[PDB]
From Swiss-Prot:
Residues 2-77 form the RRM domain. It is found in: Nucleus. This is Protein PES4. It comes from Saccharomyces cerevisiae (strain ATCC 204508 / S288c).
């Protein structure tokens, strides 16, 4: 409920890029940036404040970063039922 996925990232994306863009909505607790070696990277960002993760989706989904339209979605944990 604090975490988002960021996909369609440019391959030259750095941890600092994620930090600089996504800290604008609120304090970031943790970041994973894939060491994908292919066409696009992905990131997993956890916010300290739950409200900020929703803000990040609202503000950065479909945001262009180096010509790439970012996909920013909620990282929802596994549901209980099949």
């Amino acid at each position: 409920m604090n975490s988002i996925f960021i996909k369609n990232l440019p391959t030259i994306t750095t941890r600092d890029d994620i930090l600089n863009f996504f800290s604008e909505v609120g304090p970031i607790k943790s970041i994973y940036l894939s060491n994908a070696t292919v066409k696009y990277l992905w990131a997993f960002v956890t916010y300290k404040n739950s409200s900020d993760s929703e803000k990040a989706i609202k503000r950065y989904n479909n945001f262009y970063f180096r010509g790439k339209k970012l996909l920013v979605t909620r990282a929802q944990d596994k549901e209980e039922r099949a």
